[PDB]
XYZ file of C-alpha atoms in Angstrom:
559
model
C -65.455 -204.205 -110.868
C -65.148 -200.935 -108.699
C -66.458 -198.292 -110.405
C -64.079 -196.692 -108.057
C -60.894 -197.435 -105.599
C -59.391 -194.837 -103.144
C -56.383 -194.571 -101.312
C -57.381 -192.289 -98.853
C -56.059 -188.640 -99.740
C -59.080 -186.333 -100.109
C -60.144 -184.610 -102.962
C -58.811 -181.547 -102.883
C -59.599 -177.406 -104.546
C -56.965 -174.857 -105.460
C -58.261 -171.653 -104.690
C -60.783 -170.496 -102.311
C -64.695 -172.049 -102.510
C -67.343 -169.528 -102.220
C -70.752 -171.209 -101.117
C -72.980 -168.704 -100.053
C -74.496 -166.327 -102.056
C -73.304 -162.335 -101.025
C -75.548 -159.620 -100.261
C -75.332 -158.044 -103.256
C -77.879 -155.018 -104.447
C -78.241 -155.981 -107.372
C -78.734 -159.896 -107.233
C -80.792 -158.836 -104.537
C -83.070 -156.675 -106.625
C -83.540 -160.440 -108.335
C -83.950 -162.802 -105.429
C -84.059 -161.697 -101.524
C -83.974 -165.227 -100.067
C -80.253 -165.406 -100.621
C -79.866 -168.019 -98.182
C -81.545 -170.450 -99.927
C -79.203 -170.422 -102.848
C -75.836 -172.480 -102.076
C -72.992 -173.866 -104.122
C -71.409 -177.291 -104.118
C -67.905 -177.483 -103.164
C -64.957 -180.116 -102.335
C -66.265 -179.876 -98.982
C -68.665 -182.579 -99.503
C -66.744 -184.541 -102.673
C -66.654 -187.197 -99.030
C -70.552 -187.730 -100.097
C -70.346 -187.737 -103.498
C -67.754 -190.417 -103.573
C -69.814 -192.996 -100.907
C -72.698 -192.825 -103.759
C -70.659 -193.351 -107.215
C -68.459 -196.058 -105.576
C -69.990 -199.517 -106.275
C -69.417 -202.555 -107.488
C -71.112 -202.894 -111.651
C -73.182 -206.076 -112.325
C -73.179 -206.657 -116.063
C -74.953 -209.734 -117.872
C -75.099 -209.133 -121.765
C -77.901 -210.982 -124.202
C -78.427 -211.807 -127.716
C -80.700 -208.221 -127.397
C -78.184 -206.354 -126.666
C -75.368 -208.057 -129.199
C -78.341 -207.560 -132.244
C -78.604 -203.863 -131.469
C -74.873 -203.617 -131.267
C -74.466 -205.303 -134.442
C -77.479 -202.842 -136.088
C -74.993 -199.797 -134.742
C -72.078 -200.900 -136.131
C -73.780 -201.542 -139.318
C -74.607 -198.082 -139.675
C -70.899 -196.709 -138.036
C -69.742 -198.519 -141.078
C -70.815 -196.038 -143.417
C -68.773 -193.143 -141.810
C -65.120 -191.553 -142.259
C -63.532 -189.661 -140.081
C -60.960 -187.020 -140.815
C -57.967 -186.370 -138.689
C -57.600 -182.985 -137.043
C -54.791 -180.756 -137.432
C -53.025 -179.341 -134.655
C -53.847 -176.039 -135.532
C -57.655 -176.734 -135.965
C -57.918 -178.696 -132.649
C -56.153 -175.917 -130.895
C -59.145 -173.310 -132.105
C -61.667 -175.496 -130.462
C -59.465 -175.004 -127.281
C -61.079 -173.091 -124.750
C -59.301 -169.566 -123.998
C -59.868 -170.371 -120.117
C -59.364 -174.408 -120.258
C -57.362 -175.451 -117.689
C -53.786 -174.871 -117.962
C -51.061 -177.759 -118.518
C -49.143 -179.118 -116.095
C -46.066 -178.595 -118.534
C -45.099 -174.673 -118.827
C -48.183 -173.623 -121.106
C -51.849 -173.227 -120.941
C -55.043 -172.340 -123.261
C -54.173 -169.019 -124.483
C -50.931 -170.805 -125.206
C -52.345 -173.241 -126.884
C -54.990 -170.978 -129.016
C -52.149 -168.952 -130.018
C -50.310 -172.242 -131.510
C -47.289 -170.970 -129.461
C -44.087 -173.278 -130.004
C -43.643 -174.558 -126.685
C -47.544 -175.548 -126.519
C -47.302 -176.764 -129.880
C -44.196 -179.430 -129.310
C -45.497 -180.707 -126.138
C -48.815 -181.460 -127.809
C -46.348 -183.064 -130.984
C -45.106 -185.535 -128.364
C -47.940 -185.826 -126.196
C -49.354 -187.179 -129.691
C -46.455 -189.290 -130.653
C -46.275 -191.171 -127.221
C -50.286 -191.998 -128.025
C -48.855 -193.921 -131.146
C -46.091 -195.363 -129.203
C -47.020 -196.585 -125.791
C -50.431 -198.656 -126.137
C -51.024 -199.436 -122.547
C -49.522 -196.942 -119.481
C -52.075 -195.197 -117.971
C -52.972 -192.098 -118.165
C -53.380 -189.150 -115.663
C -56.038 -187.589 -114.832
C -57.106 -184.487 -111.833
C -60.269 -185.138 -110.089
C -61.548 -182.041 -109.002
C -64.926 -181.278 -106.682
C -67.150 -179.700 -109.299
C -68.931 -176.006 -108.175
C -72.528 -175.967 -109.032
C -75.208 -173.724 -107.597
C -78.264 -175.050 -106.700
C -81.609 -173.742 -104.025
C -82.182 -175.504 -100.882
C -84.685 -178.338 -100.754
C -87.292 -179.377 -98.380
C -78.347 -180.099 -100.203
C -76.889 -181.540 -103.246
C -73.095 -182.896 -103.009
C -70.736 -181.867 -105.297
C -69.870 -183.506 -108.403
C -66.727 -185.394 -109.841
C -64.505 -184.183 -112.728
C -62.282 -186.193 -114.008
C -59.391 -184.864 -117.006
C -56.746 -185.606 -118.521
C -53.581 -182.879 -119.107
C -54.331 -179.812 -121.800
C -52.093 -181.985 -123.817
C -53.990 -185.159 -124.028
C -56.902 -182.882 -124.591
C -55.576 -181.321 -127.436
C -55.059 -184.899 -129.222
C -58.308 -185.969 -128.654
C -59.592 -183.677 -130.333
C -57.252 -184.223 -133.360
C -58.049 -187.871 -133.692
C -62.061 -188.131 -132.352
C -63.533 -184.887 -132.658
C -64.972 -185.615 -136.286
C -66.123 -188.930 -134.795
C -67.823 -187.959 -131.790
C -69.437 -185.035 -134.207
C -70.864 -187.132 -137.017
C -71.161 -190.789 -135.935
C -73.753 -190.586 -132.794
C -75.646 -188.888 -135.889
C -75.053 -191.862 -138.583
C -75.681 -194.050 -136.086
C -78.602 -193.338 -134.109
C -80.632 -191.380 -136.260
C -83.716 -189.096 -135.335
C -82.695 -190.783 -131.719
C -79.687 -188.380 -131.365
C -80.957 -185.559 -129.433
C -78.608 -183.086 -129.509
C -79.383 -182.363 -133.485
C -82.019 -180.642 -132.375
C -82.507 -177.071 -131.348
C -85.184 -176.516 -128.300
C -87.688 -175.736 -131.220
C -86.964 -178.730 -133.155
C -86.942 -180.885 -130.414
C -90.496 -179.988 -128.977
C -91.142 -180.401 -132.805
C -89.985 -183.854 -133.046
C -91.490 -184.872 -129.442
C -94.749 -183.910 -130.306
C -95.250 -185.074 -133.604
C -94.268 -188.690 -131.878
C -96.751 -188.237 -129.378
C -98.922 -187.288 -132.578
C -98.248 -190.045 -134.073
C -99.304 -193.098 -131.724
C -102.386 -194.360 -131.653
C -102.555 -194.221 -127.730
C -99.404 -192.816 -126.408
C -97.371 -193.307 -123.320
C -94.170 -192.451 -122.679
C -91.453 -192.250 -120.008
C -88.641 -190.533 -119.377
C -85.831 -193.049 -117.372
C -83.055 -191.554 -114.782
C -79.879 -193.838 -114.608
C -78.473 -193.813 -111.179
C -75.142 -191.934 -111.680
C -74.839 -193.194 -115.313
C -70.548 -192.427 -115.301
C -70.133 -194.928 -112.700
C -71.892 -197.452 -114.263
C -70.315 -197.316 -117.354
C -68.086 -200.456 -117.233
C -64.760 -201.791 -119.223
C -66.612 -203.742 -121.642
C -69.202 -200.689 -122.401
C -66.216 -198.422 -123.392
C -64.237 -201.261 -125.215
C -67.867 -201.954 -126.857
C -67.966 -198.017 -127.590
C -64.777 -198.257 -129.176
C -65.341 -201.193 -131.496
C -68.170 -198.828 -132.957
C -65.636 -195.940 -133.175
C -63.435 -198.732 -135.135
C -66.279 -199.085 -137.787
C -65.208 -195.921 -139.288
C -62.439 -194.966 -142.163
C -59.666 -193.626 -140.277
C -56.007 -192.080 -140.819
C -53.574 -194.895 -139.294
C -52.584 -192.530 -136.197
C -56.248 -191.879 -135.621
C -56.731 -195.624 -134.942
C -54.024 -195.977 -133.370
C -54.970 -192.759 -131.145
C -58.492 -194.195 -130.586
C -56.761 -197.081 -129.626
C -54.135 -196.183 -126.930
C -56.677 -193.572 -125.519
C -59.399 -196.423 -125.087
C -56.680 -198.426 -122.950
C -55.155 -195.654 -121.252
C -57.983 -193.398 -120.576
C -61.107 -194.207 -121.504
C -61.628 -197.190 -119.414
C -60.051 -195.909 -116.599
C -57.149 -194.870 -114.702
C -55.220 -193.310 -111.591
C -56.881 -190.084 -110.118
C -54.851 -187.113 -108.891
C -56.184 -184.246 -106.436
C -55.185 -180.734 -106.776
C -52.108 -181.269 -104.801
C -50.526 -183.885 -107.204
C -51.809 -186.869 -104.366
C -52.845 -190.128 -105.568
C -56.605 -190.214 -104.904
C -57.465 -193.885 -106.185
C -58.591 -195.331 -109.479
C -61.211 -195.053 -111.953
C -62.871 -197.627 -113.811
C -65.865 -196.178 -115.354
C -66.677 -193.585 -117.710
C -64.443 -189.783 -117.041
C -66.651 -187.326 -117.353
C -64.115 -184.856 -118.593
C -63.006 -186.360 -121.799
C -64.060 -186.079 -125.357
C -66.251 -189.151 -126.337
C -68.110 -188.742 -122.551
C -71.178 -187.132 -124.726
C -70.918 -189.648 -127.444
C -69.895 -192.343 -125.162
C -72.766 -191.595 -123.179
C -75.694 -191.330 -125.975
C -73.796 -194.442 -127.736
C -74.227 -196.757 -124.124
C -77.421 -195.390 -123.406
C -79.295 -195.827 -126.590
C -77.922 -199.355 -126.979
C -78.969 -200.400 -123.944
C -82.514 -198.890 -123.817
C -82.953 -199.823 -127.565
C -82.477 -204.164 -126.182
C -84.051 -203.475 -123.418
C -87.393 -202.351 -124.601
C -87.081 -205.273 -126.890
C -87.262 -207.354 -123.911
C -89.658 -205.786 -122.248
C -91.812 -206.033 -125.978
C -92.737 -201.970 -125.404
C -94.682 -201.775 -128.673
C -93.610 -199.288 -131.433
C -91.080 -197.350 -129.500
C -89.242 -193.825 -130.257
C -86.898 -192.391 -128.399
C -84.472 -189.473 -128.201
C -81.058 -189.562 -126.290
C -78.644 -186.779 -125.031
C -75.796 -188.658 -123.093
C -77.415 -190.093 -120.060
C -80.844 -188.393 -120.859
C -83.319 -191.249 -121.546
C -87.157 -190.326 -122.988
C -89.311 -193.029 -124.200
C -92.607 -192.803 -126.012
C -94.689 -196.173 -126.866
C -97.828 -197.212 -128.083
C -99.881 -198.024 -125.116
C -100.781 -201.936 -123.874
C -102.976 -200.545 -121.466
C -102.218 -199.388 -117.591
C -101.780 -202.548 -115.987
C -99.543 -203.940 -119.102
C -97.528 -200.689 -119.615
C -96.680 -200.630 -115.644
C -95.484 -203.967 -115.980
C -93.601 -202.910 -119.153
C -91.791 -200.391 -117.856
C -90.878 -202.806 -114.475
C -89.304 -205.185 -117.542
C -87.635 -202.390 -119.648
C -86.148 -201.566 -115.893
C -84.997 -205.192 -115.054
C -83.603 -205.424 -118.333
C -81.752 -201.580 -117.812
C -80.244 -203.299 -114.399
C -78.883 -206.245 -116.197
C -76.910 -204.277 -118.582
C -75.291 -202.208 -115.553
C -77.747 -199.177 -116.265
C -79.836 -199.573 -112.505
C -82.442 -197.112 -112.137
C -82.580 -193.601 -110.257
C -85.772 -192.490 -109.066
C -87.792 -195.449 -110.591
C -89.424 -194.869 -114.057
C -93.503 -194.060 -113.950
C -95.573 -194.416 -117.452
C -96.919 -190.876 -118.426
C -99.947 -190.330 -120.159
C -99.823 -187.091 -121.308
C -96.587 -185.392 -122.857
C -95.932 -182.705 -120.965
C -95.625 -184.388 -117.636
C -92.744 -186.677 -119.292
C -89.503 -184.784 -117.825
C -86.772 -184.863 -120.088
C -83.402 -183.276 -120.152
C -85.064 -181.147 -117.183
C -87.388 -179.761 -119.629
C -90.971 -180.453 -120.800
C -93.422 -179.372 -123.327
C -96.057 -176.838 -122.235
C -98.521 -174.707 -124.788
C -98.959 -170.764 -125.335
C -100.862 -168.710 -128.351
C -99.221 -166.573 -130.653
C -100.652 -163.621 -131.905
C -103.224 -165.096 -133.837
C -104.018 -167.489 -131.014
C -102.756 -170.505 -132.634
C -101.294 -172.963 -130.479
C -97.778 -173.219 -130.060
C -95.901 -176.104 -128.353
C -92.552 -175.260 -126.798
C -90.170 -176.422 -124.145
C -89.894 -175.014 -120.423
C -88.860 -176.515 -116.751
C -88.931 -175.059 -113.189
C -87.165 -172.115 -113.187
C -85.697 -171.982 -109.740
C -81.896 -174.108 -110.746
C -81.932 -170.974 -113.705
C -82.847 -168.113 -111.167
C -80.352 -169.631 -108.538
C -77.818 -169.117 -110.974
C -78.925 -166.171 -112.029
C -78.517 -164.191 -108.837
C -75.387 -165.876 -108.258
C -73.821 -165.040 -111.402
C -74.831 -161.503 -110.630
C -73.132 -161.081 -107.811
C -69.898 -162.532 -108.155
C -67.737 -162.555 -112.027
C -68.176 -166.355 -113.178
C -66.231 -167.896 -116.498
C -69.581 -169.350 -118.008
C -72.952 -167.103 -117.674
C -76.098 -169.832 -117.870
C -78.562 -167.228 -118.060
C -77.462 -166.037 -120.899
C -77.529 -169.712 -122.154
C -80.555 -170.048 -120.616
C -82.351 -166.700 -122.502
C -81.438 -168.862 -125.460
C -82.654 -172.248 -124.992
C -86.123 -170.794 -122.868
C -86.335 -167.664 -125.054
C -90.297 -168.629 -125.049
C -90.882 -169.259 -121.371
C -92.620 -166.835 -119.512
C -89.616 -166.710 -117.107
C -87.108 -166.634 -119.340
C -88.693 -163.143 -121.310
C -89.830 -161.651 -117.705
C -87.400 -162.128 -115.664
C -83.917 -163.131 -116.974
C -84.109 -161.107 -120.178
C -85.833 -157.473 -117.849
C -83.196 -158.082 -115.017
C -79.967 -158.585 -117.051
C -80.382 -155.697 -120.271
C -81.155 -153.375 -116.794
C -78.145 -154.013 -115.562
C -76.229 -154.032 -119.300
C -77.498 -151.062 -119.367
C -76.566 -149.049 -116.285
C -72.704 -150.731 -117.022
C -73.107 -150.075 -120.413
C -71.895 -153.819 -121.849
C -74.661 -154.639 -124.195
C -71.620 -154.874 -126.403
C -69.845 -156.940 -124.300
C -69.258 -160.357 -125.067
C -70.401 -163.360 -122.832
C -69.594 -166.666 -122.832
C -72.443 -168.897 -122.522
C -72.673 -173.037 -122.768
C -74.812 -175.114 -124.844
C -74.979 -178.688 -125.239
C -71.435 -178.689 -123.515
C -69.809 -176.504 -125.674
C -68.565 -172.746 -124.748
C -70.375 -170.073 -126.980
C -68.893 -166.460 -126.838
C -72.056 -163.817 -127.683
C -72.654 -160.098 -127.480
C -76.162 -159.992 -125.903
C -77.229 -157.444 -128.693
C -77.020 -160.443 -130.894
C -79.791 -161.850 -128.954
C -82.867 -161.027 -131.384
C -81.415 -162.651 -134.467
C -80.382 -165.669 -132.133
C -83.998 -166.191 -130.616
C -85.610 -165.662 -134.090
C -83.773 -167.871 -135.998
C -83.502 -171.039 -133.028
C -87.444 -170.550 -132.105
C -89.326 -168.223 -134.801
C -90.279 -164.682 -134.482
C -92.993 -166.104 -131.689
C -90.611 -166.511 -129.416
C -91.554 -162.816 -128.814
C -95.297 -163.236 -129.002
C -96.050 -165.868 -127.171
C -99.043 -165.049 -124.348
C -101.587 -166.841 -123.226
C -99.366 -169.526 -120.873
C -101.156 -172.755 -119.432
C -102.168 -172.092 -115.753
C -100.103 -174.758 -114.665
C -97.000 -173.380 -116.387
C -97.469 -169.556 -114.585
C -98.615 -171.198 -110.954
C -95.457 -173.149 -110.883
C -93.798 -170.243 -112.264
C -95.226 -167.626 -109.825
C -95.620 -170.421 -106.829
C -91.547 -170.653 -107.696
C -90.463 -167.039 -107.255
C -92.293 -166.791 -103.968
C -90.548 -169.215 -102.511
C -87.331 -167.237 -103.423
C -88.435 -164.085 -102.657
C -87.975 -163.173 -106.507
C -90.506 -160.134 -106.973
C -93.917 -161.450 -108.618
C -94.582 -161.050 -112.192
C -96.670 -157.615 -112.400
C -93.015 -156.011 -110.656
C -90.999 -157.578 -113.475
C -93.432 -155.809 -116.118
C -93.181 -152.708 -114.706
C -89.436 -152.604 -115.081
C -88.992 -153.963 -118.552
C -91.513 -151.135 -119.336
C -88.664 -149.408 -118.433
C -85.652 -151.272 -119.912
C -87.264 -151.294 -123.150
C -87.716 -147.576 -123.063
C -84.183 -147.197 -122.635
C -83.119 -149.565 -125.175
C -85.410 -147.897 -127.523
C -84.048 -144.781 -127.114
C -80.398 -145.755 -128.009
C -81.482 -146.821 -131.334
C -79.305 -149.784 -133.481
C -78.982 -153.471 -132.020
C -80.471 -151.900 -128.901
C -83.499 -150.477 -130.009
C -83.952 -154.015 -131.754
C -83.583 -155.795 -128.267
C -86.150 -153.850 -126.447
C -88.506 -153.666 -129.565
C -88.570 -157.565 -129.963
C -87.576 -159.052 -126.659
C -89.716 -156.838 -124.694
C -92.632 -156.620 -126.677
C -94.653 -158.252 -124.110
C -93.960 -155.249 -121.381
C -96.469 -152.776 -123.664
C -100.203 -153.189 -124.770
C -100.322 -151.391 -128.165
C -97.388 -153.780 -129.161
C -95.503 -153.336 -132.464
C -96.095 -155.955 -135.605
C -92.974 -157.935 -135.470
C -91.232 -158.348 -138.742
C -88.595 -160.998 -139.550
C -85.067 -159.562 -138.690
C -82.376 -159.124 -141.976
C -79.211 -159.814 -139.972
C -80.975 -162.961 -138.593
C -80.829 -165.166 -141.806
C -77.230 -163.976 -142.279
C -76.072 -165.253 -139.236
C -73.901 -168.635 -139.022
C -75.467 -170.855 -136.260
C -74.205 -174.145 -138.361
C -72.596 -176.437 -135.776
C -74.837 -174.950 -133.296
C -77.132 -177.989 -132.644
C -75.429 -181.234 -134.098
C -73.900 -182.752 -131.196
C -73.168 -182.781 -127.060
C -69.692 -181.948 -125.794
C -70.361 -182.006 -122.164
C -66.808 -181.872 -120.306
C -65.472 -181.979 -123.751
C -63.305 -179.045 -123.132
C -64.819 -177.674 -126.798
C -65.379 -174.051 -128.256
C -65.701 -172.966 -131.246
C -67.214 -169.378 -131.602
């Protein structure tokens, strides 16, 4: 069916859309190409829409029923605990979007009574009513991307605060421990960036002759059908539940899940959706669920030999023990037919790799750098240029999430990430005096409040103290990395090591947290550099719940 219907009325914003980036000293201390950095607004939802409207072509097999029958197997084994209201309103985000019915987040947080009763009903109708609809806002989603040799926006879809709050209570402990029981080592977001370049290259490791492939699903949401979200739920129904929380899996399958009416900003009735929202709660585990059943049967039929793969939502990475060119092409041609007949058509079309770190996977790939012994150490990078956009952008103008901060974390070992994001923003901490400030920063989805001082401890105990003594980078990993900032007019490296030379001084020099910051983060900026010793308050930090699952658009934080 249509993956989408419209009546007509546009999407629409609220406030004001800011799309170019400002002329601001200090972004522009960062990047001096300005022009090239743009974000997405409603302005061009028009496009967006044209290319996630279709009509979804679904043909199951006996493949794809065995694999379902393996998952539910293991779903079996799991029970699921109910949520209270109080402990789904602390996952509520302080700055979630308010409620259409006198109350918002920080109402909501603060388990205030009117919040509270609305959510008491909102729950009590999901036990009662099995079958009406339920709203949802479609909003033009503000991204910030750099020119290309431009992007349109992209579609949220969410239900009320209110609805929110009860999804939480009845699937938040399934959406956080069954894509785990279920898929195994497959899950991906288990895995901290460490662990993950860990597990990928042990795999590749492992095969005799590896290949592997990493496959892009054209606009996986839309082509998420009925039957994949009814099929989702009949795994969620493997677990032990409370009888509201099946009943709440239930009605929100039928009234949200699998679709419903779409509202703009100005209360109009945009059209319908039947296909995956991306602004719910199961859209992560929905996601990784779909996907990994669907690439597990179809590399059945295509008879890939002695695959392993890892899955984050629509993220697909593949690696195989190789058949030879010619067979593996024609592989990979099957595993995509197979893909297309169970509504999963591909993107840019998959290629066989040879040689792990040209796979591309969750934008990131393996590259290799020495420690300071000069052994070899595998970790994950990507093209910086999406992470710099950003970065000047969120310098210049107050945003509610900061991705470079999320960013230092999950690159602390790129070359980048340590000269450039990590020198530019402790300068400007510095000169505003917030190192103490708290940030909020995303990760897998999920909002992450953290004083930057924290940093050290962070880095050390996600990567290993050589996260700050990396050196030695592979030439292809600095040319795309220098090639990169020239083209937006970023200063080159050698100006980036002069002034952490300079923002570690300073650091240094207030002593505490500080001193710890510029001592281990900017190690690199000095030549008789310090032995680095394993930080005390690392260990003692709680990062549990960190890396065990995705909550993209799941409207989670818990911090």
């Amino acid at each position: 069916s249509m993956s989408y219907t419209w009546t007509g009325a546009l999407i629409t914003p609220c406030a004001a859309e800011e799309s170019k980036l400002p002329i601001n000293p200090l972004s522009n201390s960062l990047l001096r190409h300005h022009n090239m950095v743009y974000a997405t607004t409603s302005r061009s939802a028009s496009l967006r829409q044209k290319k996630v409207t279709f009509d979804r072509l679904q043909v199951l097999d006996d493949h794809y029923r065995d694999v379902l029958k393996e998952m539910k197997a293991k779903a079996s084994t799991v029970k699921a605990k109910l949520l209270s209201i109080e402990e789904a309103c602390k996952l509520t985000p302080p700055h979630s979007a308010k409620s259409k019915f006198g109350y918002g987040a920080k109402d909501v947080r603060n388990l205030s009574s009117r919040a509270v009763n609305h959510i008491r009903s909102v729950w009590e109708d999901l036990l009662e009513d099995t079958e009406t609809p339920i709203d949802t806002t479609i909003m033009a989603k503000s991204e910030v991307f750099c020119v290309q040799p431009r992007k349109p926006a992209r579609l949220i879809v969410f239900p009320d605060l209110g609805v929110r709050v009860c999804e939480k209570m009845a699937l938040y402990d399934v959406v956080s421990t069954l894509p785990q029981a279920v898929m195994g080592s497959s899950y991906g977001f288990q895995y901290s960036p460490k662990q993950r370049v860990e597990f990928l290259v042990n795999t590749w490791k492992s095969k005799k002759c590896p290949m592997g492939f990493s496959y892009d699903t054209r606009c996986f949401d839309s082509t998420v059908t009925e039957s994949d979200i009814r099929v989702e739920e009949s795994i969620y129904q493997c677990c032990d539940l409370a009888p509201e929380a099946r009943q709440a899996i239930r009605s929100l399958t039928e009234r949200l899940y699998i679709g419903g009416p779409l509202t703009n900003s100005k209360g109009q009735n945009c059209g319908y959706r039947r296909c995956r929202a991306s602004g719910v709660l199961t859209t992560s585990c929905g996601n990784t669920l779909t996907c990994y059943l669907k690439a597990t049967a179809a590399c059945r039929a295509a008879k890939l030999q002695d695959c392993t793969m890892l899955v984050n939502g629509d993220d697909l990475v593949v690696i195989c023990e190789s058949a030879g060119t010619q067979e593996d092409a024609a592989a990979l041609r099957a595993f995509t037919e197979a893909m297309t007949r169970y509504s999963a058509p591909p993107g840019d079309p998959p290629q066989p790799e040879y040689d792990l770190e040209l796979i591309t996977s969750c934008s990131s790939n393996v590259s290799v750098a020495h420690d300071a012994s000069g052994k070899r150490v595998y970790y994950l990078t990507r093209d910086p240029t999406t992470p710099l956009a950003r970065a000047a952008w969120e310098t210049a103008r107050h945003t509610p999430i900061n991705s470079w901060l999320g960013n230092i974390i999950m690159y602390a070992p790129t070359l980048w990430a340590r000269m450039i994001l990590m020198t530019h923003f402790f300068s400007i901490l510095l000169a505003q005096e917030q190192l103490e400030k708290a940030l909020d920063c995303q990760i897998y989805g999920a909002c992450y409040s953290i004083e930057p001082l924290d940093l050290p401890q962070i880095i050390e105990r996600l990567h290993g103290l050589s996260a700050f003594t990396l050196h030695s980078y592979s030439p292809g990993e600095i040319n795309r990395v220098a090639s990169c900032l020239r083209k937006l007019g970023v200063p080159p490296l050698r100006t980036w090591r002069h002034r952490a030379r300079s923002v570690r001084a300073k650091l240094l020099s207030q002593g505490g947290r500080a001193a710890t910051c510029g001592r281990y983060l900017f190690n690199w900026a000095v030549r008789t550099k310090l032995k680095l010793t394993p930080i005390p308050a690392a260990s003692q930090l709680d990062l549990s719940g960190w890396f065990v699952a995705g909550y993209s658009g799941g409207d989670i934080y818990h911090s």
